[PDB]
Amino acid sequence: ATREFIEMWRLLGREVPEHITEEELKTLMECVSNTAKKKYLKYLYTKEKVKKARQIKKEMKAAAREEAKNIKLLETTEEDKQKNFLFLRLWDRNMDIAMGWKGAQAMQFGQPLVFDMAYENYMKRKELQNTVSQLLESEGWNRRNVDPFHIYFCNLKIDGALHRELVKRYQEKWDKLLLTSTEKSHVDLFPKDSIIYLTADSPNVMTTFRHDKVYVIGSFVDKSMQPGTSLAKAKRLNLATECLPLDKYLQWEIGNKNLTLDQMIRILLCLKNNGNWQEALQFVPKRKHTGFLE
Amino acid sequence: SGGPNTVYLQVVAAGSRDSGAALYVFSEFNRYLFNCGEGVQRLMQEHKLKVARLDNIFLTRMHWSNVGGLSGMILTLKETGLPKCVLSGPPQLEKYLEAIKIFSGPLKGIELAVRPHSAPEYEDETMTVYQIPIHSLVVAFICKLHLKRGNFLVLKAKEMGLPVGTAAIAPIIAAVKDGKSITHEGREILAEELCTPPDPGAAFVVVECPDESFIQPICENATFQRYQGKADAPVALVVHMAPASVLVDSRYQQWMERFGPDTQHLVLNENCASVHNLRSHKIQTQLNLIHPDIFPLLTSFRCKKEGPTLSVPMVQGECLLKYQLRPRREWQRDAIITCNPEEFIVEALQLPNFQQSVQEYRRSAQDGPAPAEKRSQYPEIIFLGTGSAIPMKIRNVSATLVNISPDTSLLLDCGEGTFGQLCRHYGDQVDRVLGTLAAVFVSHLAADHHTGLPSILLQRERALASLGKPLHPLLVVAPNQLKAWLQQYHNQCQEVLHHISMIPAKCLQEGAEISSPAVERLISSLLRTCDLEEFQTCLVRHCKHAFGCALVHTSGWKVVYSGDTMPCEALVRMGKDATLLIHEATLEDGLEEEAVEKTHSTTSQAISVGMRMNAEFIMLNHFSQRYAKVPLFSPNFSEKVGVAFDHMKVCFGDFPTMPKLIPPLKALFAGDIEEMEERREKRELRQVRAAL
RNA sequence: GUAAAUAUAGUUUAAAAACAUCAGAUUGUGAAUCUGACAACAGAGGCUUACCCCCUUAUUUACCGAGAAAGCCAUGCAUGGCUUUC
Numbered sequence A: 001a002t003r004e005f006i007e008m009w010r011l012l013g014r015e016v017p018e019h020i021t022e023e024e025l026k027t028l029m030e031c032v033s034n035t036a037k038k039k040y041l042k043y044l045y046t047k048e049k050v051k052k053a054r055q056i057k058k059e060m061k062a063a064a065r066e067e068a069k070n071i072k073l074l075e076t077t078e079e080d081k082q083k084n085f086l087f088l089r090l091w092d093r094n095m096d097i098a099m100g101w102k103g104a105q106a107m108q109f110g111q112p113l114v115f116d117m118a119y120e121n122y123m124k125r126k127e128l129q130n131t132v133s134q135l136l137e138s139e140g141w142n143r144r145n146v147d148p149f150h151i152y153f154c155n156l157k158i159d160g161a162l163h164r165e166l167v168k169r170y171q172e173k174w175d176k177l178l179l180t181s182t183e184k185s186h187v188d189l190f191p192k193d194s195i196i197y198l199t200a201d202s203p204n205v206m207t208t209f210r211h212d213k214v215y216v217i218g219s220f221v222d223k224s225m226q227p228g229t230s231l232a233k234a235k236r237l238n239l240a241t242e243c244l245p246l247d248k249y250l251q252w253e254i255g256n257k258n259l260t261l262d263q264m265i266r267i268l269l270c271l272k273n274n275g276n277w278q279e280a281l282q283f284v285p286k287r288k289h290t291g292f293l294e
Numbered sequence B: 001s002g003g004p005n006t007v008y009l010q011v012v013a014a015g016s017r018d019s020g021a022a023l024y025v026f027s028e029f030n031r032y033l034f035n036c037g038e039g040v041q042r043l044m045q046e047h048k049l050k051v052a053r054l055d056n057i058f059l060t061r062m063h064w065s066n067v068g069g070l071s072g073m074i075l076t077l078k079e080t081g082l083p084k085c086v087l088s089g090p091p092q093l094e095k096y097l098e099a100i101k102i103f104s105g106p107l108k109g110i111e112l113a114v115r116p117h118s119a120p121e122y123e124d125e126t127m128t129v130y131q132i133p134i135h136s137l138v139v140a141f142i143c144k145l146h147l148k149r150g151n152f153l154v155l156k157a158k159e160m161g162l163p164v165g166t167a168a169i170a171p172i173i174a175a176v177k178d179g180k181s182i183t184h185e186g187r188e189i190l191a192e193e194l195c196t197p198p199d200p201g202a203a204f205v206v207v208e209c210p211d212e213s214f215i216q217p218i219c220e221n222a223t224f225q226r227y228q229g230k231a232d233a234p235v236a237l238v239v240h241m242a243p244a245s246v247l248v249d250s251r252y253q254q255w256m257e258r259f260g261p262d263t264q265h266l267v268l269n270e271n272c273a274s275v276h277n278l279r280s281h282k283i284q285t286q287l288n289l290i291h292p293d294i295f296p297l298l299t300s301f302r303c304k305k306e307g308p309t310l311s312v313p314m315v316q317g318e319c320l321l322k323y324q325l326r327p328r329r330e331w332q333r334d335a336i337i338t339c340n341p342e343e344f345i346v347e348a349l350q351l352p353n354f355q356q357s358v359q360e361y362r363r364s365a366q367d368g369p370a371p372a373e374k375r376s377q378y379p380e381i382i383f384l385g386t387g388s389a390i391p392m393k394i395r396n397v398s399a400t401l402v403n404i405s406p407d408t409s410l411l412l413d414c415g416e417g418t419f420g421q422l423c424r425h426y427g428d429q430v431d432r433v434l435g436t437l438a439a440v441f442v443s444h445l446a447a448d449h450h451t452g453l454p455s456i457l458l459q460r461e462r463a464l465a466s467l468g469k470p471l472h473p474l475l476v477v478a479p480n481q482l483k484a485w486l487q488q489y490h491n492q493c494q495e496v497l498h499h500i501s502m503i504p505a506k507c508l509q510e511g512a513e514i515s516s517p518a519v520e521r522l523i524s525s526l527l528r529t530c531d532l533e534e535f536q537t538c539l540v541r542h543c544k545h546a547f548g549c550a551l552v553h554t555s556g557w558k559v560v561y562s563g564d565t566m567p568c569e570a571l572v573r574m575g576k577d578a579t580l581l582i583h584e585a586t587l588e589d590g591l592e593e594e595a596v597e598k599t600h601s602t603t604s605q606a607i608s609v610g611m612r613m614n615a616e617f618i619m620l621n622h623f624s625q626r627y628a629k630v631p632l633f634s635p636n637f638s639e640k641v642g643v644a645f646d647h648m649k650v651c652f653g654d655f656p657t658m659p660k661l662i663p664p665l666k667a668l669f670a671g672d673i674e675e676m677e678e679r680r681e682k683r684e685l686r687q688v689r690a691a692l
Numbered sequence C: 001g002u003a004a005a006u007a008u009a010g011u012u013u014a015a016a017a018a019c020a021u022c023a024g025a026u027u028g029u030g031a032a033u034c035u036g037a038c039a040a041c042a043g044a045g046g047c048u049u050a051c052c053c054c055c056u057u058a059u060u061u062a063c064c065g066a067g068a069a070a071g072c073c074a075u076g077c078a079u080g081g082c083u084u085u086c
């Protein structure tokens, strides 16, 4: 009956996926009615379309690489670099090991930066997936930096949805990520005076990056606007709040004033490395503003 | 051409004696309003109701209480840019439309059509409206929804293997939608087989019944009998706008019972109790904390006893009451206003420096000495609204009342909806308060400053009925233009001038010359009624036919009101050493050029005149939306500064206390203070960009 | 507050690709890869196969009341001031 009417709307011609799994059908059933299910089905269909297109492109490139590899075999010119090599080609491993050493040094002496995962109740499933993806990108950008932050994952419930998704996404790397993940709040780990909670709705405007201050970023993705939530949370603890200067330096044009976690961490990393506000704000999406105010 | 989607009905006005009997309907295609009445503009603005696509405006009776507010609605539509609008009612509305011209202002790019009762039908294929006349004259409207038979059955097309995915199938839809039977899949399929049972459209009737003289005729109506019992188009609901006494008539009750359980019988009348402005109640309740009598609680309508339990259901109407008709017919009472004073009090309390400032003010007042000279409470001055333009939620069109004595009251700036504020401010005593009125003053000739003049008069008669006093033509002072257009309204639409007496403002000017002995007698009676000694009128240089007034009593206190004007020496001479001054304050300093262009002064000019006036105290009034909630504060301002707010009560003894209230005011406006800061930043950016 | 437009959750141009992101691979120097993860054009609501709209927030821009007719005064047929009418 259930998959029967799903096949009925398939016959209707609506864009729907094929060979769907059980968890996806459960999620679809979780939807209220009509438009929610239609959006979810269109998503899944587009996901399958992209997956199959990537499969076709990958097979094409594999065949092209095979034939081109035989062609390159035809040369047999030899005398390649005289075999005068100082290092073996193990560069990805060495980069990972160097990043690990730098992460250990940062965990011991790095400046704290907190992501507070206390919004799971303000986020839908899709927003949760987006938040996890942006958290991965932010952590990756932090690792590569010449002077990484010491990243804290505060208020991260062990069995919560966000922690579950992070564990699923990171696999065994989760236990080896060079960062501090804890259920306690940022107020239980650092003095209340050193904490600055970054929000877009704060009356105060950030002027300079401070190296003795602990910046708190709300790991929140609200494509359904909920202004003042991070500000309200910071007010309960009575924490100082700051907002990025975007009206001062950029002609905002059309867009939303709340950036993503990855953009936020990149801006903060640029500022921490003695970058100016122009260089730091180069990470703001160009489609939003029109230029840097002169 | 298409079919109507979900449609909604809404009760804009709860039906109270103040700004009642307003109905609204909206669908995707378009939206309509019934009995715009008076003051519904502010009500719609507050509740975020969309005014666009309001092509048609409807009504039930010619009474000003049902048609008084048309001017504001049409002006708002003109501002929006809607090019066309039409009205439905008795043919005399045409003349009434002409009347509006005399104070319409610049009207262009807008069409003002009319839909007389003689018109057969309106149609538009979206919603149909029926016109039904009444006589002892009232008109009721029956609205029938358009047919939406378009439907297709599920999975039987697949069983029939229809050639889907092609274009030639699209015409075939009409064949099944129109009612054609065709042979497909070896079946002589009929259109009804593949079509959901068509619904012609729900019907609903709107009617107003002033009294039994209109209860009796309605039953002897063929149109009503058509929809009574086994109606061709069953009626989903009926809305009645009549008092409780009319609602309990034996004939009326029988007529209501005729339809049976099929109907729902929504009703609207004075007995309904609700709040028409959450923001106003919230702000006045918050202000009440600072001091009781300056900011008295706004008494809310509260019916003592619910209406008698009639056999048929009686769904009492409420503000924001919502009823969906399609695709489901139900009472969607989801966003109905609620009264939670405690929530407002706690929300205000959870503000920075607010409670602390209030406590500090309490300490200062307690330690402060008692008022010297034991100044008498009377006279009192109550500011109902201080708005300068189309009323907003925060404020209202300029209007003030001065109670000289418990039996003598005068009114200034009788703007739009003033009776609404009178009701909201004086609950049931409104009868005594209205009887207390001796005369009403008119400011410079302008619609905003005299929009609500007619309604007041009508209500007075009702109050006179409550008290039973003999008829007393209320006095009013104004230019001859007011007399002319009021006479036109009297002799065309609704007879009201017999309840009024008029006095030219020029005859009251300093050194004026009596025009007629009757004028002299009228002005002498005016002076005697309120125990006043001198009433002075002076010209003001902001527009033609503009007057500023001054009151001097036997006790010697001199109070001067100016309204729209600019610093004038004659004003200082007239109000030299005046006890109090109430002056307009539209824009802020630094914008002198646009102040001159609009002929309105700013704060700096207000202080300049006040120190020129040499008056004991100065009050600000006539503000604009740009000052959404807060007036400018600065130590450079003298202690005499006074900022008005809705339903603000003041007396002479309060003069040494107004400046002491400056902090707590700004304490409550923290968010609005931030708004002012952002506005000032924007103004600075604009000014520097212009300079460079 | 009211009308317009606009809204790409890593970025950009288009209307789907490129650059990116996370996990694993001790890679013989094309790893310039291979195996996987992610893939939602602001948020929510229908309705005819497909035909779009209605609403809520966010960003940027501009923001509410006097036509004619007749009689008189002054200036060089036109203008200014006033009086009665709609």
Ligand SMILES: Nc1ncnc2c1ncn2[C@@H]1O[C@H](CSCC[C@H](N)C(=O)O)[C@@H](O)[C@H]1O
Pocket: A198, A199, A200, A216, A217, A218, A219, A220, A221, A222, A226, A227, A228, A229, A230, A231, A242, A243, A244, A246, A257, A258, A259, A260, A261, A264
């Ligand atoms: N302009 C800005 N200034 C300061 N912090 C900002 C910012 N834009 C984004 N952020 C940070 O990035 C996080 C994800 S944006 C989500 C914003 C959401 N309205 C809220 O209540 O926070 C924000 O929580 C904030 O920590």
Ligand SMILES: [Zn+2]
Pocket: B387, B388, B398, B449, B563, B564, B584, B622
């Ligand atoms: Zn005014």
